[PDB]
Amino acid sequence: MKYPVEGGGNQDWWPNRLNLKVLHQNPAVADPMGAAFDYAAEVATIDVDALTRDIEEVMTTSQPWWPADYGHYGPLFIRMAWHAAGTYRIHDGRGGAGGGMQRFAPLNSWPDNASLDKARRLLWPVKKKYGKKLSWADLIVFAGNCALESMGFKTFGFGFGRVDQWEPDEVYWGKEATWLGDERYSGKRDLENPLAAVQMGLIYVNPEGPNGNPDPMAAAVDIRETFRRMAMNDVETAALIVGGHTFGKTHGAGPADLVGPEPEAAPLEQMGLGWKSSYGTGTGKDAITSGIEVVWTNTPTKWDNSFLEILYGYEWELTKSPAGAWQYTAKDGAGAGTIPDPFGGPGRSPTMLATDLSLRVDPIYERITRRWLEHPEELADEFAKAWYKLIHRDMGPVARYLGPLVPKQTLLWQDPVPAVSHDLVGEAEIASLKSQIRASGLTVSQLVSTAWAAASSFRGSDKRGGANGGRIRLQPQVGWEVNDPDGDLRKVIRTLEEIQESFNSAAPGNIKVSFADLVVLGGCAAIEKAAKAAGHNITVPFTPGRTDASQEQTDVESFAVLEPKADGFRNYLGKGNPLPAEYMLLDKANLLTLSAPEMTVLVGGLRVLGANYKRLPLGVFTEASESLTNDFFVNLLDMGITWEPSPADDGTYQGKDGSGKVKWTGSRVDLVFGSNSELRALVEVYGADDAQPKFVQDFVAAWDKVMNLDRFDVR
Amino acid sequence: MKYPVEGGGNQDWWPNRLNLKVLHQNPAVADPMGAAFDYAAEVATIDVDALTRDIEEVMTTSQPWWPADYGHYGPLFIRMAWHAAGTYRIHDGRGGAGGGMQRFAPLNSWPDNASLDKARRLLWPVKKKYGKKLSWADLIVFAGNCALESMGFKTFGFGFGRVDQWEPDEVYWGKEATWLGDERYSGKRDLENPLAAVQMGLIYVNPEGPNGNPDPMAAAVDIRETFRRMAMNDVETAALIVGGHTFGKTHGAGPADLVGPEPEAAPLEQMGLGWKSSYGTGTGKDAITSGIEVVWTNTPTKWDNSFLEILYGYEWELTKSPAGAWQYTAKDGAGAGTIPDPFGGPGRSPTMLATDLSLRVDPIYERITRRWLEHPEELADEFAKAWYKLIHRDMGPVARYLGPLVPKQTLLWQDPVPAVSHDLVGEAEIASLKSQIRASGLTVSQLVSTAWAAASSFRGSDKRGGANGGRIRLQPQVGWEVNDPDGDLRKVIRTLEEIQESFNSAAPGNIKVSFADLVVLGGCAAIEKAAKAAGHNITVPFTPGRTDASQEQTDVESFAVLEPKADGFRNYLGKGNPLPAEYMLLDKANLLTLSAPEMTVLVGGLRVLGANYKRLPLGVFTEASESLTNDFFVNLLDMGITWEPSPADDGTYQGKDGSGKVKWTGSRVDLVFGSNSELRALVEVYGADDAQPKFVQDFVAAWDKVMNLDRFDVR
C-alpha cells in the first residue's frame, strides 16, 4: 500500500510474520559516533562540578517559550527524570532511563510525557557544552538528581555511563491502539504481563483513580501493583510519591481540547515540540499538561515535611480542575491562600491528587506515611535510597557506574558479587582445568547445558543475569524447570565444586578459581572435546574473573523474573507465553543481544551438542551426538525428508524418509529455520559442503559472546 | 497493537512517518559472511565448466516432488531467470536479478512467481556444492543461461559477480493491497511511475490481455509500455518473447482454487515451499501455475524456429484452459496431436497466449516477427543480445562482470567509458592541479556544486550514473534543470577543460588527466579551501582513473531516467514527486547508498558551501559562506529562532529572531533535521561545541564516498 520511505513493507502482506529486525536494533550504520568511540572514556573525564553548576544555571534561568514555575525548573526536571526511569518493568527488564529513550517515539509523545518535550529542550545548552562527554541518557536523569540537590535534598549518589542510542528501542507497551486505552486486564484485576502501567501511554497509574474513578482506596491497589512491577515495595513506593510531590505542581489551567498534537504528529515548524496550546499564552500561568491543577505543598521548590503535614493536616473533598479533572481540595475553606502561585498570583487552597490520598487511605501506606509525618528523617533516608534505585535500576552490574559520585555502599537489588580477592588463573591453569573437567566424567551435554543455563540467564534490557556470581547453584536458578533440577544439574554442580576445592587446595601460589568461572570453563572444555570429535582442533576462548555470590547476595523474588518460560536454544517451551515458540525464540535472542546469524549457529550447535531440555531428540538432526558438526543445517535442507505435524497435536513434527519411516522429529523452533525464507538463507550458508570450519568458528564466537554477556568487569 | 517480534512499531501510531530504516538496509550484523568476505575473490576461482555440467545434471534429473516436464527442467529455469531479471524498472533502477531478491518476500510469493519456489529448490544441490564461491543471485540467472545452451541456443556470454543479500530490498511495487489488484492507471492508459507492471504481483503484463480481456491488439500496448519501462525496445521485446516461448509450457491442469497459500503464508512443514495443490497429484501432469494450459511449440526442449512457424502457420480462435483461463487454439482442428505431452500422454493441438498473438496482430511486432519467420538467424542474434541485456541490466559498470564467459564486445546500454590509455596523475600532479583549480577563479560553490552534480547522478539500485565518464558536459546531464544549465555550469566546464588542455600539453612524461577526474578534483580542492577558511588544514582524498565518454557512448534517452526530480542535498524540488520533499531526500540518500549520519553531514556541509540549486539561501544557516563549518547544525538547534510557514505558501519557512525579524529561511528538507526526533539526535551531535573537527572529518569521508560511488574499476 505505501512506499518503504513512508513505512511500507512485507508486514503489510503477511501481518503476523516473524520480525527478524528485532535482531538488528541500533545498527552500526545508524550510529554517527564511529567504531572507536568509547562513551565510558569520554564521561570519565567530565567536570562534574562544572556540569552541576551549568544545570543549576539552566534550572534558575526562565526561558520565555516555557516560563519556569516559581522561577525554578527543578521540579519539572524531577518529573522528567522520574518519567525517564519510570517506564521500567521487571517482567522483561525493558523500559527505564538506560538508553535515553524518552527523546524518541513513542515515549516522547505519550500523554503522560506531555511538556517533557520542553523540559528536554531546556537542557540543550548543557548537552551543547559537554557534547561527546555527556549522553542525553545520563543528562536527563542527572538533571533530576541535581534538581533535588539544588532544592535542599541530599541524594545517595549517582553513576554516569548510560550510552545514547540512535533509533528507538521497539518495546511492547500494550495492545491498545488508542491513547489511554485499556485492554490489559483479566480476572479480578490481573494486569497483562509484561506490562507495568494501567492504561496505554501512562507511566504507572491514572492520577484520577482507576478508569478515572477518584477512589483513593481503589487507586492504591493500582499503585501497589504497578510499582511492584517496577521493582518498588511499599516503603519505596510511598517514599517516591511523597518525595516527588514535595516539589512543584501539576498543570491544567484550561480545557485540554485546546492542546495541539503530540510531538511526533506535530507540524515541522514546531521543531520537535508538541502539545501547542491555544489556551491563553499556552505556557506558564496558562500551562496545561495533565489537565489537573494541584500544588501539593506551600514550598514547591524546597525540601521539607510539608507534603505529609498538609496531607494529614486537612480533610479532603472531591473537586474539579479548570480542565474538568478530578482532584481533592481542603474541606471547609481551610488553608485558603496558603499555597503560592507559580507566577506571583493570589495564594491558593491546599490540593491533592486522588492517588496522593491513597497514601493516607490505604492501611499499609497510612502506617508508613504517618510514621514519616512524625519522623521525617526516615522519609529522607528512604526516598534517597528509592530515588537512587529508580534512576539506576536498569544499569546492570555496578562496574558500569562511572564518575566521582558513585557511592561505596553495595545494594541487594544490584545483584552484587564479591570482589576478586586472589590471583586469577593464567594460560597454564586454564589448560590444566579444562583437562581436569574433561577427565571428571561429566558428559559434553551436561557441561554445555549447564554453562548455557548459567550464561543465558542474562538479559540485555536491564543487564541483569548471567554466569557471573555462580548463581546456578543458588535459589531460584537451581530450581528453575528449564535448568531441570531433577536432572543432572546437582551432580554437575557437585563435581565442579570438587574440582574447585581440589584446584584451590592443591595449587600453591596465590591463584584461586571460582565455581562461577568453572561452570563456564566446563562448557568451553566440552566444546573443545566435541570439536575434536568432529575433526577440528580448536581452543574456545575463556575470560576468568567471575566470583561466587552467596545466597544472601541473591534476592530470590527479584531473580524470579529472570526465569525463562521459553528457551528455543534448549528447545524448551513452558506454559504462559504470549506467542508461538518461534516468536519467543527471537525474543530470547534479542534479550541475549544476538544477531540472526549468531542465533542460527547457536541453535544448530546446541542441538547436536545435546544441550536440549531433558535431552529430547527434537531438532537433534545428527547421527553423531557429542560431536560439533553442521549436521543440523545439512539435514534441515534435505528434500528427502517430508515433514508433517505429529498425530498427537503436541507442537512437534515428524520428518519421514522415502520409505515413510520417521527419521527426525522437530519443534516449531526447529522447523522455522527451514521454513522462514530469511532464516533458511542462513541455514544454506552453514549447510553447504564448504561450511564446517566456518560453522565451528562462528559457533565458538557466538558461544563466547554469550558466556561474556554480563562481564562489564573486564570491559 | 502488536509485539515488535510480530512486526509492531512506531509506524502503528504515526502511519506516514519518515522511515529512516531505508538508510540501513542490509545491516552488517545480519550478514553471516563476516567483514573480510570477498565474493569477487571467491567466484574468481570457480570451475565454470564443472558448474555447467552440474547444472546440466540437475536439469535432466527429475525429482519426484516436482517432476520435470519432458524430462528437462531447462525451460522452468529460463522462466525463473527471466522472472528474476524481469522485476527491473528504469525509473528508479530497482528490481532485477542483481541481489537474488526472488528468494525473499514479497517476490518469492508473487502470483507470477508461482512454482519458482520449486525451481529454486531444485538448485540447492548446486549451491550446496559450490558454497561461498557461488551466490544464489548468480546461480539463478546462470541456470537460465545454461538451460538455453543445453537446449541448443548459443548465448552471447555471462558475467558473474552478483552479491547475495540477507534481507529483502524493500521496494514500492504499487498501492494495491490485493494480489493482481490494479489502481495504477490514469488518463487514457498512463501507468503510474515508477511501476513497470500492469497489476500488483505481475512481472509485466496479464497473459490473458489487459484486465483479463484477451484482445491481442490491446495487450501489445501493455507489452510495449512495460518492456519499455524495463529498458527493452520493440526488437528486443519481440526477441525475448519468441526466444522464451520457444521453450517449455504453461501449467493449468485443474481449477486454481485447489492451489494452497503462497510460500510466505504457507505452514512450517512445507519448508519454504508454497502453492501446494490438492488437484490430483498436485505436480507434473496435474501441475497448475498460471492457470493457463499452453504448449507453444512441438519442440519444448529444443531451440528452433517452431514458435514463429506455428504462430503464422495457423489461424487462432479463443478458448479456455481447464482452469478457465483465456488462451488461443488453432482453428478447424488443424495440427491435432502435433504438440507433445510433458509426460508421454496423447499429442495435443497448437496453442498460444493472447500476448503471443500480439506479436502477429500488432503492426510493429508483425513486421519484426514476419521477418524472423524467414530469417531465423536474425532472431537468434537479437535474442542473444536481448537475453544478455536482460540478465545483466542492473550489473552497473562492466568492471563488475567476472569470470571466463564475459564477452569482449562493449554495448551502448552499459554506458561505456574509454580504457585508461596513459599514466595516472600522482601525488605531485594532484597537488599541482588542486592549486591550479583554486587559482582558476572558479568559486567554492561552483566547484563543489558541479562535482556534486556529476557524482550524485549515481544510483545504487542498478549502479548506473556517477562522475566517471565526465558526462556532466554531455547530453542530457548538461541540460538537466537541477544541474542549472543557464547558470555557471558551461563556464565551469570550459574552465576545467582549459586546465585539462594546459596540464596535458604542458606536462611531459606519460601523465595525462581526464576532464572527468578534474570535475571531481575541483570539488575536492574547493572543500580544502573552505576547510582552511574555517581553520582546518585538511587534505580531501582523491582517486584518479575516471575517463571521458563521448556523446556517442552516451544514450540520451537511457540517461533520461537518471534526472533528479528532487535533490534535497541541493535543496532542489521539481514537479511530479510522489511524496513531500523530506521523503524524497531519504529516497535520494538511499539511492546514493548513504547512512543517516552521512546524509546529515552532507546536507549541513553542502548548504554552507553554497551548493544549493540557484544559490538559494534556504538552509544556508551561516554568516560565513564558502567556509566549512557546522553552522547549519548549531543554528538549526537555536531556540532563539521561531519557525513559521512562509505567507506565500511556497513550501518555505521563515526563522524569526526575538525582534520578529526574519534571520533564516528554510525548506521542508532543512527543517526536517530539527523536527524529526531521530534526525535531530544526529544534528545535536554535529551542533555541539566540541564537534567542528568531527563534522569536517565526517563530511569529507561522506563526500569521498559519493565521489567514488561508480568507481568499480578500482575495487
Ligand code: HEM
Ligand atoms: C502514584 C504515582 C504518581 C502519580 C499518579 C503522579 C501524578 C502526577 C501528575 C498528574 C503530575 C502533573 C503533571 C503536570 O500536569 O504537569 C505530576 C507531577 C509531578 N510529579 Fe508525580 N506522580 C506519581 C509519582 C511521582 C514520583 C515517583 C515522582 C518522583 C519521585 C513524582 C514527581 C513529580 C514532580 C516533581 C511533579 C511536578 C512537575 C512540575 O512541577 O512540573 N511523581 N505527578
Ligand code: HEM
Ligand atoms: C509478454 C511477455 C510474457 C508473458 C505475458 C509471459 C507469460 C507466461 C506465462 C503465463 C507462462 C506460464 C507459467 C506457468 O503456468 O507455468 C510462461 C511460461 C514461460 N515463459 Fe513467458 N511470458 C512472457 C515473456 C517471457 C520472456 C521474455 C521469457 C524469456 C526470455 C519467457 C520465458 C518463459 C518460459 C521458458 C516458460 C515455460 C516455463 C516452463 O516450461 O515451466 N517468457 N510465460
